[PDB]
């Protein structure tokens, strides 16, 4: 259960204590969180979705998998499959759709579940490449307009921030009308590890966060894999979200939770570390 934010504050300076030893034991306790649980993944280890992963090891679990409208004719059946979860957050189920970044094969899938989930904020944490690994595919128009399936996606604007862009596209459903989506796209996190200063990280989660507006599909939040840098902001969010609502903080029981919904989320000791530094800078700031 959750604790005051001074209680935490503290608690802070606990987990790094005796060479790190309590982040250390509360990491494993996540890793070890759903393991009697069986969850399922029939859909993603399927071999015509085989295809749609990006990671053979990076799954969508079954009961909180977002489902595409099947398409009719041949090939129906598993045209419904896309690797990605419905995510909580705070007080608010569903609030993010946590993915992968896509591929060339998932670009038509990846826009017509943005459209059928009316969302309208994609956060991408990557880049393309990273230190020669290719992480994601550029699924966006570098200019004028790109057709995936149905939907028609126009560049409207960039913005270049020191840390982030933020590009707004106007989308168009061929068979519909027109719907703004605004991209948060942080282009500095470091090809190892996690990001030295958390600063630039808390702008670009207060900054993407404040754009979701009222009545409004989730959030798209998506890195590479969709877990460790996606989880991260998931929980960054949610969290500041607590402590400006209630002053409390649960960061391990919330990731506990939400490991229920999508493996892996919050990949790392280190991210899971970078999330308690990201949250007594905004409680100190």
Same mark, same amino acid.
């Not at 921030?161 to 719907?179: G, L, P, Q």
């Given at each position: 259960?959750?604790?005051?934010?001074?209680?935490?504050?503290?608690?802070? @300076?606990?987990?790094?204590?005796?060479?790190?030893? @309590?982040?250390?034991?509360?990491?494993?306790?996540?890793?070890?969180?759903? #393991?009697?649980?069986?969850?399922? #993944?029939?859909?993603?280890?399927?071999?015509?979705?085989?295809?749609?992963?990006?990671?053979?090891?990076?799954?969508?679990?079954?009961?909180?998998?977002?489902?595409?409208?099947?398409?009719?004719?041949?090939?129906?059946?598993?045209?419904?499959?896309?690797? #990605?979860?419905?995510?909580?957050?705070?007080?608010?189920?569903?609030?993010?759709?946590?993915?992968?970044?896509?591929?060339?094969?998932?670009?038509?899938?990846?826009?017509?579940?943005?459209?059928?989930?009316?969302?309208?904020?994609? &956060?991408?944490?990557?880049?393309?490449?990273?230190?020669?690994?290719?992480?994601?595919?550029?699924?966006?128009?570098?200019?004028?307009?790109?057709?995936?399936?149905?939907?028609?996606?126009?560049?409207?604007?960039?913005?270049?921030?020191?840390?982030?862009?933020?590009?707004?596209?106007?989308?168009?459903?061929?068979? &519909?009308?027109?719907? &703004?989506?605004?991209?948060?796209?942080?282009?500095?996190?470091?090809?190892?590890? &996690?990001?030295?200063? #958390?600063?630039?990280?808390?702008?670009?989660?207060?900054?993407?966060?404040?754009?979701?507006?009222?009545?409004? @599909?989730?959030?798209?939040?998506?890195?590479?894999?969709?877990? @460790?840098?996606?989880?991260?902001?998931?929980?960054?969010?949610?969290?500041?979200?607590?402590?400006?609502?209630?002053?409390?903080?649960?960061?391990?029981?919330?990731?506990?939770?939400?490991?229920?919904?999508?493996?892996?989320?919050?990949?790392?000791?280190?991210?899971?570390?970078?999330?308690?530094?990201?949250?007594?800078?905004?409680?100190?700031?």
């Amino acid at each position: 259960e959750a604790i005051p934010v001074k209680q935490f504050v503290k608690h802070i @300076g606990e987990l790094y204590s005796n060479n790190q030893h @309590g982040f250390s034991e509360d990491f494993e306790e996540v890793q070890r969180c759903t #393991a009697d649980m069986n969850i399922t #993944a029939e859909h993603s280890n399927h071999p015509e979705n085989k295809h749609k992963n990006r990671y053979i090891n990076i799954l969508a679990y079954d009961h909180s998998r977002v489902k595409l409208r099947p398409l009719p004719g041949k090939d129906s059946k598993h045209s419904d499959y896309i690797n #990605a979860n419905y995510v909580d957050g705070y007080n608010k189920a569903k609030a993010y759709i946590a993915t992968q970044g896509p591929l060339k094969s998932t670009f038509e899938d990846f826009w017509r579940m943005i459209w059928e989930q009316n969302t309208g904020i994609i &956060v991408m944490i990557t880049n393309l490449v990273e230190k020669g690994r290719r992480k994601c595919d550029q699924y966006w128009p570098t200019e004028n307009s790109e057709e995936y399936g149905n939907i028609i996606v126009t560049l409207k604007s960039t913005k270049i921030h020191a840390c982030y862009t933020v590009r707004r596209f106007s989308i168009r459903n061929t068979k &519909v009308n027109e719907r &703004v989506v605004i991209q948060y796209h942080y282009t500095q996190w470091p090809d190892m590890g &996690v990001p030295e200063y #958390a600063l630039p990280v808390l702008t670009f989660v207060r900054r993407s966060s404040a754009a979701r507006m009222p009545e409004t @599909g989730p959030v798209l939040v998506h890195c590479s894999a969709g877990v @460790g840098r996606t989880g991260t902001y998931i929980v960054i969010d949610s969290m500041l979200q607590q402590i400006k609502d209630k002053s409390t903080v649960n960061v391990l029981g919330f990731l506990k939770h939400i490991r229920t919904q999508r493996n892996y989320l919050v990949q790392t000791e280190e991210q899971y570390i970078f999330i308690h530094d990201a949250l007594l800078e905004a409680i100190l700031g």
